[PDB]
Design a protein around this ligand. Structure first.
Ligand SMILES: [Zn+2]
Ligand SMILES: [Zn+2]
Ligand SMILES: [Zn+2]
Ligand SMILES: [Zn+2]
Ligand SMILES: [Zn+2]
Ligand SMILES: [Zn+2]
Ligand SMILES: [Zn+2]
Ligand SMILES: [Zn+2]
Ligand SMILES: [Zn+2]
Ligand SMILES: [Zn+2]
Lengths: 184, 185, 185, 185, 185, 185, 184, 185, 185, 185
């Protein structure tokens, strides 16, 4: 009975900040917020095996596959404010390739949680490593943080880059550079 | 002001309900940070237009339109409590009085740091300026992206919304409104 | 609602007729995926306008035009069953009521996920908004690229098509229409 | 080759199952147009590399790398039968033989106009080039957007995928590969 | 119907007169290739508007303007027999009937694949569309670069030429023409 | 020395064979204009490298690389007699002597105004410069679009071709070539 | 003896804010500041007649002349912090045209003063009106203000547009629009 | 025409007065190169409009506006003898006569290659066009940067100047002028 | 703290000395505003790194480089007391500890809100981060425009200055420094 | 320092020889303006490096490279006396001392306001900085457009020339040089 509990909490939140839950513009707000939050945290209850499904196929070649620009939206665990941007995924197969759409589904699984950008990148990389067991995986996350833009320091031109490199992407300098070069 | 203690408690419980552990290192100080954050995000309700403007009202130097554009803003939609942000463009034709440019930004923040709907935000900003300067006319255009539309639900990514408010000559004089809008292009 | 089992069979036969092997490892689950895909791409016929709006209709805050631009859309041309896509720009002047921004996107998807001609898409979105809000007027601009025109036939690569529908003041008032169009530039 | 009548009937029934009316003025000739479209979209299965090249092979002028970039392509994903498209970048170092520039586009189309996965498309284009000419090396980079990801399922909008294949010196000589890749930036 | 053999002969003599070896390895098949080329580049003379449009003329979904922009074209200037190319933008207001998007591209190619003058090209495309749809009005804009101006003679590099033709309401309604032209910006 | 009269004759017969009226108002002076045109477009064959460079060869001010980029060029492909054009980038490390910037453009035009193959063009320009300055090394990159590929046959639109030639240190010193190529990005 | 007086004031300013006028990086600072300020206020002591010189010529035609993008730098009189941008000048002659370089010299005359952007535009327009007595003059000033960016509100994306229209630019709607259109 | 020897000696002495050494290896042929350069830069004084046009006048194809934009030009300011350059935009409505596109560039150069002031340059180009053809109207817009402002005196860097001339309908018909000006944006 | 009264007095006199009237309406409150402004512009001297960081130090989630870029800054040159501003790019490889992203901005401000020289600014920011996190390495790049170079003296307009500081692995490991710098491109 | 009276006379005679009237109202004061202009454009010969630097040499704050980019420059080619311009990018690694940023611009102007060849300009600026600071190394990159190449002779429009000079570590250390160059991209 979590949605109802969230609704009540949201209703009281509105009052504590000085608003009126009874005015027209806020009537269904506690309910809308509850559903929004169940969706924004749905990643905690997802299972990788189910997320990937039967979309793993035999590798067609040996070269690096790069899936760039997968937009994501997450919530920083420190202030509970959104941070969003793009996730760039690169990998070298070892007999298995993933359906392109599954990369976005994996990204969403870890993004729709309370996060820190440094963690988001490692978890995405590790999930891909588990599913495909590739020669190597590279993940670059680049996002803008509202907890830095609409509050506190209030900087406007800043964006953060975090990444995770596994297998040959970590141990082969040229391989890493080639992946990072594809992103420029 | 805002009962930070109650906000903290509510936030601590919110963490438990969504499935998290309020005890872990990364969330220990979260309720506190969130309470402070929301007090700041709603400080606009507790502001006074006269205090916000201060002593930054000066004599007009001319009768031509003054356009202050690209004033970035950040707000919270009253429908989903998710941020919506962008820029506010202000235009006005003086009547003996002009405002310190930085005060436009302060007025924008006063009405943005509340729970809002973009349509209202433009109107209140325009009305606040009309009250302070009693100009011949005021024009306000708000352009913003909404996370409640990108981060969830419909999940559209390329959309932006434009709202505005036109007072005095900006409403009645087509050429004046058009000139203001052309300046934004 | 749609006979997925029959779509699967049709797709399986389709693969065989074009010269492919339905037994390939890369096509085993294709008829199933195709069936699901097409049920989604045609879900627009099974939707109801009032359920899509869901009561997210609120009182107008001002009299000024609201412009929701860049709403991405994806559709299928009824002529070749090949995708055509781009953006939908919506503008309207309220008469008592405004719509929750995301509902415009939901209205767009409702008519886009059907077999269409871009000319009809612009009309139906505009009419739907007209029915839901009974505004002083509504304007809709659809801009899209057509694959039936680039990956087949003439094979042109730089072309884009603009269609539009104007109701009420967006049709009757030349100045309101131009202002809406200017906002899109 | 392909049974257009079989495809016609399959498409006609496809319209009915998804909930449409084949009798509609706009859908009258659709089953026919679809059959011919799909015959065109799969024509690459029936093409011969020897005829595609048409003996447009000439003696090499030098030993330096030739880069043919931005060859747009259109294909269909074998998993969902939805289009994916973009550009194909080709680079090679001759060994007494160079190919007519336009034949590279003809080779790209030969393999694109089939059911595919982007990883395979790049390999077959490179292998085809290595077969036609006897280059010291070949490099092929494919970059495309996939509608199966954009208009359905995950519905991501900013994503693009890069796949490639390196043969000969492009695989052995690190500097050569980097030089090719740098030319594409 | 064009005499390919006669063209090969003329082309072979052309190569000699300019001081080149027709027996050279990379020129042996040139007269043949040039012959086929020019037959394609002038095929527009041998086309019928009735066949080009086919049966893709459907009922209008609305009365609003339809704008098909960025239709790339390639032609040959009759004065120097050197290529000139760019894009063709078409706008029209239907009267009960609309055309299939792609057919616009075919009409453009029909008049472009001839020896031309840009001023004439814009007129012939507009008249063709007027004859086919008999709409309330048609607007056509052609914008291109001319090699006879940049590759020879004056050798200017940044120049582009705009020519157009306006029929029906696009000529009679000033607002209509402006709205069409604004869509192109 | 080219027989202009013979070209006019051949051009006049060319106009007839394709199904056009040579007596037409806008074609009467065409054979004459085409004759003069082709004499100019092939004048490169009738030029001497010694005269082209003139006496503009001066002592080197330093030992660092000189990069002359963006030298636009226009040529004619020997296979189809259709224009191909773009830019030529030249890089070199002098050995006591440097060339006047503009002379680089003249050398480019000398080899471009002929019937060519892009691979050959890059080689001949590089060899010409090597012969004139006898520097430590020379690097030449040619990038262009080919009308025979976009205006005819495959009709691809986004494609561009890069060909090059490396002499001396630009071939022997990997760092030197990379540095030259990086300047072009 | 103003430069010396400014030097002394600047030296004390350094101390009051917590700095040390004796450290190497500040040694010649009081002197540098004094000269900078004499230059930044030189506009007060300039004479229009001298600024224009003999660069007024007979008009060649009747159409509008538009000199756009004349960069300027000024000091806001409210906080003594810089505001800068561009000045766009448009005018229709009545027998006399000005040397293009003189427009920039006129702009500098009024910019190098303590200003408010609204005033800067009118003074530039009025100066041009006096020198040429044209059928009309139009001046558009667009600048960014540091007193708004590096202090106070601290907004980053904002820029202000001010203008002045005299003669036919004020009274002829089409003429004004044509001028403003040239700036887009 | 021009006395190259007189110019040579003047330039040779100019070098001495500014403090240079005419005996320097780099200045040896300078006085000569300068004389020929200045003869070229002033050649427009000695050109005849009738010969520049070379009878390249053809019967009008339509009544719609022809716009030739981006014709780059280079000139010298009569006040400082420093270069100013940019582009020339030409627009006109025919009256039975149209001009060869390349002749517009030839006319621009005729008046640019003189000592000038930008205001006059536009007027003379328009007057020249009105003389050659008998258009219903002519519009000419010149946009250039002036080195006399950039490398000396005020030393402004972002400035550009626009001058124009309107004759016939471009001066009488407001809409026609606006349409021409809009085409340039 | 800062003696605002003395600053006010000094400012009031400064106004008199430059030639202004401290009595006029626009300057009456100037000394006061300027005093406050400078107290703020120098608040960095009075800050403590430990208080600035607060409790925003958390356990590292990985061993990969974290790059925080585009942090806008505003400072005052100690040479002319004129503003210099731009962006600061920070990169570091953790050793068990990572910082709250917003604290980087706070550290940047702490050292920017003082009289500075850009070379020093980069070093102090880097050192402050090294002290707080004791990372394996730190990289800081500062890019800024200087008004003392644009607003006066040399008056250059297109110049920007790049300074940096590299500590730990960012200084000793070439590949690590290079990777950080590539991320800024 | 320069005989302005003699330059005036030479210029007056120049005007007369090219075919102009020295009596025109637009040329009356031209010889005088030209003389002043040329004294300014050659003032670089009369400047002294130590006076240009003016003791604005300070102690190094760090060991990292300082890169001052985009310093605009204007110069005159000694070959044709026509302007060439663009930008100068400076990079250096200190050894005890750094230079006031604006002095780099003053050093640039000192060598630019002379008759030059771009190759020498890069060398002299680098050597000057080397002498003033005795750094571990200095790198200079000059990028410019040459009017003698665009408004005369070959008349190419897209070309730009890059010259450079590398001293100390910028010459001896491949990695430092690449890092400097990378910063310029
Ligand atoms: Zn946070
Ligand atoms: Zn919302
Ligand atoms: Zn279709
Ligand atoms: Zn798929
Ligand atoms: Zn021609
Ligand atoms: Zn060819
Ligand atoms: Zn201020
Ligand atoms: Zn001048
Ligand atoms: Zn300074
Ligand atoms: Zn020169």
């Amino acid at each position: 009975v979590d949605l109802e509990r969230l609704q009540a909490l949201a209703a009281e939140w509105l009052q504590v900040i000085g608003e009126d839950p009874g005015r027209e513009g806020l009537l269904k707000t506690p309910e809308r917020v509850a559903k929004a939050w169940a969706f924004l945290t749905r990643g905690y209850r997802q299972r990788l095996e189910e997320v990937v499904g039967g979309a793993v196929f035999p590798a067609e070649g040996s070269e690096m596959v790069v899936v760039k620009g997968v937009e994501f939206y997450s919530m920083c665990e420190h202030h509970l404010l959104p941070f969003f941007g793009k996730v760039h995924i690169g990998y070298i197969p070892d007999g298995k390739i993933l359906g392109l759409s599954k990369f976005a589904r994996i990204v969403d699984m870890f993004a729709r949680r309370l996060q820190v950008q440094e963690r988001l990148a490692v978890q995405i990389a590790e999930a891909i490593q588990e599913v495909l067991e590739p020669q190597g995986v590279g993940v670059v996350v680049e996002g803008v943080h509202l907890c830095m833009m609409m509050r506190g320091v209030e900087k406007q031109h800043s964006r953060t880059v975090t990444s995770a490199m596994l297998g040959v992407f970590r141990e082969n300098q040229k391989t890493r550079e080639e992946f990072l070069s594809h992103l420029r």
